[PDB]
């Protein structure tokens, strides 16, 4: 008497490309070519007067690895100079910048010269000066945000302009002022070793280089954020500090999309973008980190920012989790939130498809792998199988996987009774290898029972072998902010897969959540090794009606 509610779909969003999110972000700082031919040879009518940033310059990055820094091993190898600095070596006031899930702003040779040559020995390429990168890449996208209308993140931000021979730009050294290379952080005029609080010496010491604080609503999902300028500081010379930018962001999943607003009017590279983007990282989003491009291509800015501590209340916004079927062990996903995506080396693999459940097969260089994601009428959640293929077919770290978008707790209904159904996936390893694959027959397919009861807080289910009578698994759980948590089980007699004993199971842990607007959707895993009983298992199910 039983059938799935009838819920709106997910509104579909199409982000331009810069507002897609990563880990990271980085882009080359530019250089005028100031070579007197051309790559055949002829003289250039006049000299390059240009060297433009675009949207194609701008590049996603995806390290695992956050202490090895961008570039840096490229850099050292190819030097010339022995003069490689980044903006966390420490070796200044301004490099010393304490973050556990973020690095950003700058990797540089301070004096590198490029010179290509064609075949007639003509060069067509001269560049010199300052080689490097602008950049942002953070790790772990959170998870979980912290409660409250108001809360502080403090840091730094860097950029670099684009080149123009015609900019006549104050504040900046000969290094780096526009016209033969770029205008970046690295050469701007402002107070690299000086520690806010000291005095030279009755000049008082407000900030250093470039520094940006934010204040952070995540109750209503917005941010508002600073950048300044702390210039140059002497005994001649008190701190010029200048707020150069005014940030607006909305915040979607562990992400933030919004607008950088000049505060200086006639500035020809400190102009208003449109393309700002970011994320939260840390567990608990204790950092954010982002980027934008200004609308007349005159700037690439990066940000980075922690707040004090937390030691704060967090609400889960995102579940992601890779279950490895050889040593029943859990480990987390990058995902953004987006629970339609599985996330693997900067590429996006889609999940959805026409039929029920759909394997999408893709390489992510050098790996080949395979997905088979459920289900259709699951709209805020996905689960399924993830492994590698090695030749056909010998599989390679088989897994199960679940993610979801977990329901607002404060949009979780209020009571009381309701039945969910669904379907699973798991594998069974005892002697021989028990399987259950995700289906759509919910009268005698690998079936998923579950009801809920919000009055209570309590879930109970049932999972069930195809064409099984009896669950082969029961969970009972209970239900706690947006998710639930409590243990399965086999019967006390186990089950069968004669010569060995039947699998039996009791007590292992089930972690579950609640997804979509109303959390009309719910979903779980468990896993457990032992020699001899294994088990991991992923499971989702939909709300029903009557």
Same mark, same amino acid.
């Given at each position: 008497?039983?059938?799935?509610?009838?819920?709106?779909?997910?509104?579909?969003?199409?982000?331009?490309?810069? *507002?897609?999110?990563?880990? !990271? #972000?980085?882009?080359?700082?530019?250089?005028?070519? +100031?070579?007197?031919?051309?790559?055949?040879?002829?003289?250039?009518?006049?000299?390059?007067?240009?060297?433009?940033?675009?949207?194609?310059? &701008? *590049?996603?990055?995806?390290?695992?690895?956050?202490?090895?820094?961008?570039?840096?091993?490229?850099?050292?190898?190819?030097?010339?100079?022995?003069?490689?600095?980044?903006?966390?070596?420490?070796?200044?006031?301004? $490099?010393?910048?304490?973050?556990?899930?973020?690095?950003?702003?700058?990797?540089?040779?301070?004096?590198?010269?490029?010179?290509?040559?064609? $075949?007639? !020995?003509?060069?067509?390429?001269?560049?010199?000066?300052?080689?490097?990168?602008?950049?942002?890449?953070?790790?772990?996208?959170?998870?979980?945000?912290?409660?409250?209308?108001? #809360?502080?993140?403090?840091?730094?931000?860097?950029?670099?302009?684009?080149?123009?021979?015609?900019?006549?730009?104050?504040?900046?050294?000969?290094?780096?002022?526009?016209?033969?290379?770029? @205008?970046?952080? &690295?050469?701007?005029?402002?107070?690299? /070793?000086?520690?806010?609080?000291?005095?030279?010496?009755?000049?008082?010491?407000?900030?250093?280089?470039?520094?940006?604080?934010?204040?952070?609503?995540? /109750?209503?999902? $917005?941010?508002?954020?600073?950048?300044?300028?702390?210039?140059?500081?002497?005994?001649?010379?008190?701190?010029?500090?200048?707020?150069?930018?005014?940030?607006?962001?909305?915040?979607?999943?562990? +992400?933030?999309?919004?607008?950088?607003?000049?505060?200086?009017?006639?500035?020809?590279?400190?102009?208003?973008?449109?393309?700002?983007?970011?994320?939260?990282?840390?567990?608990?989003?204790?950092? *954010?980190?982002?980027?934008?491009?200004?609308?007349?291509?005159?700037?690439? @800015?990066?940000?980075? @920012?922690?707040?004090?501590?937390?030691?704060?209340?967090?609400?889960?916004?995102?579940?992601?989790?890779? &279950?490895?079927?050889?040593?029943?062990?859990?480990?987390?996903?990058?995902?953004?939130?987006?629970?339609?995506?599985? &996330?693997?080396?900067?590429?996006?693999?889609?999940?959805?498809?026409?039929?029920?459940?759909?394997?999408?097969?893709?390489?992510?260089?050098?790996?080949?792998?395979?997905? #088979?994601?459920?289900?259709?009428?699951?709209?805020? *959640?996905?689960?399924?199988?993830?492994?590698?293929?090695?030749?056909?077919?010998?599989?390679?770290?088989?897994?199960?996987?679940?993610?979801?978008?977990?329901?607002?707790?404060?949009?979780?209904? @209020? !009571?009381?009774?309701?039945?969910?159904?669904?379907?699973?996936?798991?594998?069974?390893?005892?002697?021989?290898?028990?399987?259950?694959?995700?289906?759509?027959? +919910?009268?005698?397919?690998?079936?998923?029972?579950?009801?809920?009861?919000?009055?209570?807080?309590?879930?109970?289910?049932?999972?069930?072998?195809?064409?099984?009578?009896?669950?082969?698994?029961?969970?009972?759980?209970?239900?706690?902010?947006? !998710?639930?948590?409590?243990?399965?089980?086999?019967?006390?007699?186990?089950?069968?897969?004669?010569?060995?004993?039947?699998?039996?199971?009791?007590?292992?842990?089930?972690?579950?959540?609640?997804? =979509?607007?109303?959390?009309?959707?719910?979903?779980?895993?468990?896993?457990?090794?032992?020699?001899? =009983?294994?088990?991991?298992?992923?499971?989702?199910?939909?709300?029903?009606?009557?």
């Amino acid at each position: 008497s039983y059938q799935d509610e009838e819920t709106k779909k997910k509104t579909k969003e199409e982000l331009d490309k810069l *507002m897609e999110p990563t880990l !990271g #972000v980085e882009a080359k700082i530019p250089r005028r070519n +100031r070579a007197l031919a051309d790559k055949e040879g002829n003289r250039k009518a006049t000299p390059d007067t240009t060297d433009e940033l675009s949207e194609a310059q &701008i *590049m996603a990055i995806w390290n695992e690895n956050i202490d090895e820094i961008p570039h840096l091993k490229e850099l050292n190898d190819k030097t010339t100079s022995g003069l490689i600095y980044h903006s966390h070596d420490g070796k200044q006031e301004d $490099k010393k910048r304490n973050l556990q899930y973020v690095r950003s702003g700058y990797v540089f040779d301070e004096s590198y010269s490029e010179i290509v040559k064609n $075949k007639n !020995g003509v060069p067509y390429i001269f560049k010199n000066g300052i080689d490097g990168y602008i950049y942002y890449l953070g790790t772990s996208p959170s998870k979980e945000l912290p409660k409250g209308n108001k #809360v502080t993140y403090k840091g730094t931000w860097d950029f670099t302009s684009d080149v123009k021979t015609s900019y006549e730009l104050s504040g900046f050294s000969d290094a780096g002022n526009g016209k033969n290379v770029a @205008a970046t952080s &690295i050469s701007d005029n402002v107070n690299r /070793d000086h520690k806010v609080g000291e005095k030279l010496g009755d000049n008082e010491v407000k900030g250093v280089a470039h520094s940006s604080e934010f204040a952070v609503d995540f /109750d209503n999902k $917005k941010l508002t954020g600073s950048l300044y300028r702390n210039g140059y500081i002497n005994r001649n010379k008190a701190q010029e500090v200048t707020k150069r930018y005014s940030i607006e962001a909305d915040i979607t999943g562990n +992400r933030f999309r919004g607008k950088a607003k000049a505060e200086k009017a006639g500035d020809p590279i400190f102009t208003d973008s449109n393309y700002l983007e970011g994320g939260f990282y840390g567990p608990k989003a204790e950092e *954010m980190a982002g980027k934008f491009f200004t609308n007349n291509k005159s700037l690439f @800015a990066v940000f980075a @920012a922690k707040s004090e501590n937390g030691e704060t209340t967090t609400e889960r916004i995102i579940d992601a989790t890779k &279950i490895d079927l050889t040593q029943f062990n859990a480990k987390e996903l990058n995902n953004f939130g987006d629970a339609s995506v599985l &996330i693997i080396d900067g590429q996006k693999i889609d999940l959805a498809g026409v039929n029920f459940k759909n394997s999408k097969t893709v390489e992510i260089n050098g790996k080949t792998m395979v997905a #088979v994601a459920c289900c259709s009428n699951l709209e805020y *959640m996905k689960f399924g199988q993830l492994w590698q293929k090695e030749g056909k077919q010998q599989v390679k770290d088989n897994s199960l996987f679940l993610q979801g978008e977990r329901t607002a707790t404060d949009k979780m209904p @209020a !009571g009381g009774n309701y039945k969910y159904v669904g379907t699973w996936d798991a594998l069974v390893s005892k002697g021989t290898n028990w399987i259950a694959e995700a289906d759509n027959n +919910r009268e005698s397919g690998y079936r998923t029972e579950f009801d809920v009861n919000f009055s209570d807080k309590k879930v109970n289910g049932k999972l069930f072998d195809k064409g099984g009578v009896n669950p082969v698994f029961t969970v009972d759980a209970t239900i706690n902010g947006n !998710g639930f948590i409590g243990s399965a089980k086999t019967s006390d007699s186990g089950f069968a897969l004669s010569q060995h004993g039947n699998a039996v199971f009791s007590d292992i842990k089930v972690n579950g959540g609640f997804y =979509g607007p109303t959390a009309g959707e719910l979903g779980g895993q468990f896993h457990h090794k032992s020699d001899n =009983g294994s088990v991991g298992a992923v499971f989702g199910a939909k709300r029903q009606i009557e």
